[PDB]
Amino acid sequence: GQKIRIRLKAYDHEAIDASARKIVETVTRTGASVVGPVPLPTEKNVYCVIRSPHKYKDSREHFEMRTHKRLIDILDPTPKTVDALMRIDLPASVDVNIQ
Amino acid sequence: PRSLKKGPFVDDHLLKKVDVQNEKNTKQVIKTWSRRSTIIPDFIGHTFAVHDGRKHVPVFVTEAMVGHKLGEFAPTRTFKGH
Amino acid sequence: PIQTVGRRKEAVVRVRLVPGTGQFNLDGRTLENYFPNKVHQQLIKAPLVTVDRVDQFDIYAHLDGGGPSGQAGALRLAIARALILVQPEDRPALKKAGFLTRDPRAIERKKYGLKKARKAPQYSKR
Amino acid sequence: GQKINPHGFRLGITTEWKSRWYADKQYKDYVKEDVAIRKLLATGLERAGIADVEIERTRDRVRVDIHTARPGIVIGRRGTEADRIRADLEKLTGKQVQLNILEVKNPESQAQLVAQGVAEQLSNRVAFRRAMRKAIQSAMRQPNVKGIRVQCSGRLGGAEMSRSEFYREGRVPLHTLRADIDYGLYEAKTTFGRIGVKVWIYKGDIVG
Amino acid sequence: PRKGPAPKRPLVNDPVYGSQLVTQLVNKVLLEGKKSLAERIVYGALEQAREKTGTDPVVTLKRALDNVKPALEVRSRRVGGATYQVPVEVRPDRSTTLALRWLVNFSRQRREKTMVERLANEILDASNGLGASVKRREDTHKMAEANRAFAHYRW
Amino acid sequence: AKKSKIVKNEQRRELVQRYAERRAELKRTIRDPASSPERRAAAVSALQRLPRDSSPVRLRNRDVVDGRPRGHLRKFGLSRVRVREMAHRGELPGVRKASW
Amino acid sequence: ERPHAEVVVKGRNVEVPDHFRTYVSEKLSRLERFDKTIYLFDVELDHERNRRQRKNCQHVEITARGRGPVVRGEACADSFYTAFESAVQKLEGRLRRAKDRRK
RNA sequence: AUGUGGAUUAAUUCGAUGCAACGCGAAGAACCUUACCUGGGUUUGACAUGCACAGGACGCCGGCAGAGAUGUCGGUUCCCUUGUGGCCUGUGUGCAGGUGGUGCAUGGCUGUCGUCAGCUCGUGUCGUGAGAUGUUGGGUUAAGUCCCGCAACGAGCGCAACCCUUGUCUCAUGUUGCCAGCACGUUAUGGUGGGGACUCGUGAGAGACUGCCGGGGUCAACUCGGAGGAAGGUGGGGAUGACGUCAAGUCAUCAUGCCCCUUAUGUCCAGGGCUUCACACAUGCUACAAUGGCCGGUACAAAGGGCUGCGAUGCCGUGAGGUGGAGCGAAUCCUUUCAAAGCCGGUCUCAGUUCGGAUCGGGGUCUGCAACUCGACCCCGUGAAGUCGGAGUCGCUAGUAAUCGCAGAUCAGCAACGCU
């Protein structure tokens, strides 16, 4: 058949799962074939830092910017559904690669 | 070491000045500010001088001074002992 | 089908335990092809040693993760758990030597200010 | 490093980010945009005090939000100062500034606003005793102030000394992870020099 | 250990024979975590013993342990301007530990071009009653005979 | 650091953005193959005619807020001090204190 | 080990006419005279350069090696002499303590 | 190998100072950084803004004098709409700036005693008062955790615990990864369909609560050996700094009260330095060998990095290296289908040695405009000290120590053997 693949990127797991359910819903609204957010890995961009100025290199701290990622493969891309899913609304925290 | 595909580092100032000089055919003491310029055997005629952070040093040239930089012939630090 | 797992410090192995002979096959090879380490062989054998059923139950493995000794402990673990699927009645005599537990002892986080896990820099007093 | 910020430590769980977006190559860009934003904001308006500043970014929209209990001082009443704000924000080029201005509910259980008001009182000509005491009273008479700690420091009352004396009341268990905490660190001018202020406000727990 | 001891470890057995004195020995010669290397060194030395005296090497090893395994040893304590040594009975665990420690570390400073020879022939020496291990054991017993006088502290 | 020094690094970025766009690139392109006119190019001696500032080695990743010319993290694009301070104020997405 | 007394002279920023060295080397041999377990002596000259001093203009820390414990003596005064002699006395206090705690 | 002390020095920028500094501020000092020195220009300036007066073009692209700063021709000579402005040319007026001083003027941030178990308040009773009481005394604890009798009754900030990671299991979840049951490619192979079954990556919840046993125990706590379990007696390690001292450190990350520069301690410029050494102190590694040196053959980990960049295969070079670019914002692709110890075969046969690699003379590579002070790297020859270490000291109680190698923030390339 045919596919259209979405790769969702975020930092909030609650919200990436929220928009996952929302997008799966809006894909289901057309009776169009829907699969689900497969549990695929997440990057972890990590950065160690020192706390204080001018000395005390032994005291440090860590920080960890994760990257929540979800693949959603939509089968049966009826072009009505395609141009509908082109026009979902979301808040700011999530970004999406439509390919 | 200067790579060979790049060739030498002969810098424009003294390269063009010494073009002018050998086309005058005349040789005199000539000052320059570049330690980082590499040496050609075409310098065995002229006398070059360089600055070292305090003042200038002149130096006369010899056959086996080729492939080198002029800073190698300037004393940059003085250590007479304790 | 019969399938159980073994994991020791990032050393995972799956197992097929069949009622045949004791034929060992470990990723296109056997226990005498890999593992030139006899203490490791003892580990690998200790469950069948325990039940006295050495050469009563074929085993087929797929090694991945960890190094040889981690893989070894995971192997013997999975073989014992498969024997428990064969029959649990022998289990409370296997806890008598405890050849059944996952090794709850993994490598440690490396800390800051120091040289590794617990080796501190030389507290110099000059 | 005697006590890290409860906001920065509960950030993973109980308190929430002040600038929500997603970016990969534009991250550096968005942060420098954001700091130039907030700096021009505070440099323009300082007479009524900002309570919170939040930002969000989208494909093309940009949502900047500013909480302050006294809007009429801050905003263009006719639209003057708010349009000035859009002007600065278009120089910095957010390009679609849906500037949703908001007034908070409880000016006396808003930690930063309370510290800023007390800091202004100090910076004018005043002592710190009555200001601290009345701050405690004004906060604690309201419902949700379960515990407070108000911590004033500096050359207090002109005493040429690095001093530190605080007034608290109630329950301030900063180690109670599940509970909402509000923190405010604000530094105020004075004739002699600069004073610091910190305030912790405890608020119930959170179940969820 | 201001609160109490911890249990001593669940030691392994020898894979081949069934005497954990062997693994005690290999763990005490173990050097930079090379256990299988020390182990093949062990097996080679033991096979030398078997092919050089026609016996099972573990028995002659027990023989050498019986030779050098002390009962009485020293324990020091600084008291009153002249720090005293004191005789102490020594339980089996520490006895065996110390005997094997002597045996290994004095096999180390021998002159055979190779550890498999130094070790094995030192074992032969301590077995049949000649080695530097036995020498140091006698030195220690003579020291206990010396400082018999100070047992009465009872420590 | 200083106003003047931040201004000068900003100037140098403008120079580089101008001239390493194509001017300080074509000489590299032609002078990397061994078919080059190096034997009579004087393109090396011509790259000596361009300003030294044409080269990017003189740049440095300074912070945008302070100008600390050290301790700089390209992902945040900031001095480590300001990095600490932002993540302390909870002003960067999904950033927090972790363990493992 | 008598010229083995590892003098370490130090001053972060103070005008140092060459007699501080004389005074200090001699005031160190002073206590070399009666303790033979000594390797290093660190000697430091420091100064707060604050307007309206709190009667602490010059400051001195001295620290000395020994077989096991080390010796530690701090003093503070308005000039070189009061501080050096005071630190010398405090060294002697530490050292007398240690040599009474030897036998 | 690096970091300091002292002395050289035209300049060797500044600070940090036993515990709590010395592989420190550095997470990459050739120029740049850099704050320091010789020499040159600048002076409302390297970049702005408030005034008015004289401006309508100002820049940018190439040329010349020039170490560069800097001054100078050729081409750019606006859109407003009559009131003036974007803009920049000057004139000076407000000036603008400082890495100049006070961290004992301040704030903020941080280390430290110390992740040690404590430190305080209410109201009371006692005391003329400073203050006591509670918080004393037994059991008991990792601990002011808990119980019992009492001028104390009560409480907070703490210790515990809801956080993360790991340790086990039920269900789903099916690729960019597994691939047992099946059919098809066969030189490289899950490589392709096909099964989500085991793995599994990501999330939710049960599981440890002395849960129950019986003997001890103010019968209270507190324990002693059990079952069951993946873990059992705060599973383990993490995060977390009670009030404050050391006037702890940073006016040079930053912020800033006060004092000073202003024709200059500001400021633009190229060269040089921060890598000087008859020495001292400290941190580490590489060694003093047969568990070892050398060639060749065979298998596996975790793990992350990536676009005006990571770079594959082919071939050529000894080998660093190379046109070239497949594929790649990346569970795929570069990341050999990812390694070193180790294993198998053989030599070296205990000695300044096939140990060890300094050190130098030359042959060369890459990046950078530029490798002399001053960069890393391969190759040839080079072959030094070192034959197990002094009085004392340092770190370590389990997946620890000791050892092998990998990966990387910073970074064009580097002293990175450091740090994580």
Curated annotation (Swiss-Prot), chain A:
Gene Ontology process terms (BP): translation
Record keywords, A-Z: Ribonucleoprotein, Ribosomal protein
Matches recorded under InterPro entries: Ribosomal_uS10, Ribosomal_uS10_CS, Ribosomal_uS10_dom, Ribosomal_uS10_dom_sf
Pfam families registered for this protein in UniProt: Ribosomal_S10
Gene name, Swiss-Prot/TrEMBL: rpsJ
GO cellular component, one term: ribosome
Family: Belongs to the universal ribosomal protein uS10 family.
UniProt GO MF annotations: structural constituent of ribosome; tRNA binding
Protein role: Involved in the binding of tRNA to the ribosomes.
Positions of transmembrane segments: none
Protein name stated in the entry: Small ribosomal subunit protein uS10
Swiss-Prot record, chain B:
Any Gene Ontology biological process: translation
Signal peptide as annotated in the record: none
Keyword vocabulary terms for this entry: Ribonucleoprotein, Ribosomal protein, RNA-binding, rRNA-binding
GO cellular component: cytoplasm; small ribosomal subunit
MF term (GO), any: rRNA binding
SUPFAM superfamilies linked to this entry: Ribosomal protein S19
Job of this protein: Protein S19 forms a complex with S13 that binds strongly to the 16S ribosomal RNA.
Name of this protein: Small ribosomal subunit protein uS19
Organism: Mycolicibacterium smegmatis (strain ATCC 700084 / mc(2)155) (Mycobacterium smegmatis)
Swiss-Prot record, chain C:
ATP-binding keyword on record: no
One GO-annotated biological process of the protein: translation
Any one GO MF annotation of this record: structural constituent of ribosome
Superkingdom of the source species: Bacteria
Keywords assigned by UniProt, alphabetized: Ribonucleoprotein, Ribosomal protein
GO cellular component: cytoplasm; small ribosomal subunit
UniProt keyword annotation of Ribosomal protein present: yes
Family the entry assigns: Belongs to the universal ribosomal protein uS9 family.
Name the UniProt record assigns to this protein: Small ribosomal subunit protein uS9
Shown residues in whole-protein numbering: 25 to 150 of 150
Swiss-Prot record, chain F:
Keyword Transmembrane helix found: no
Protein's UniProt keywords contain Nucleotide-binding: no
Function noted in UniProt: Binds 16S rRNA, required for the assembly of 30S particles and may also be responsible for determining the conformation of the 16S rRNA at the A site.
Domain of life: Bacteria
Keywords assigned by UniProt, alphabetized: Ribonucleoprotein, Ribosomal protein, RNA-binding, rRNA-binding
GO CC terms of this entry: small ribosomal subunit
One family name in Pfam for this protein: Ribosomal_S14
InterPro entries: Ribosomal_uS14, Ribosomal_uS14_bac/plastid
Subunit structure: Part of the 30S ribosomal subunit. Contacts proteins S3 and S10.
Name recorded for this polypeptide: Small ribosomal subunit protein uS14A
GO molecular function: rRNA binding; structural constituent of ribosome
PANTHER family, alphabetized: 30S RIBOSOMAL PROTEIN S14, SMALL RIBOSOMAL SUBUNIT PROTEIN US14A
GO BP of this protein: translation
UniProt record similarity statement: Belongs to the universal ribosomal protein uS14 family.
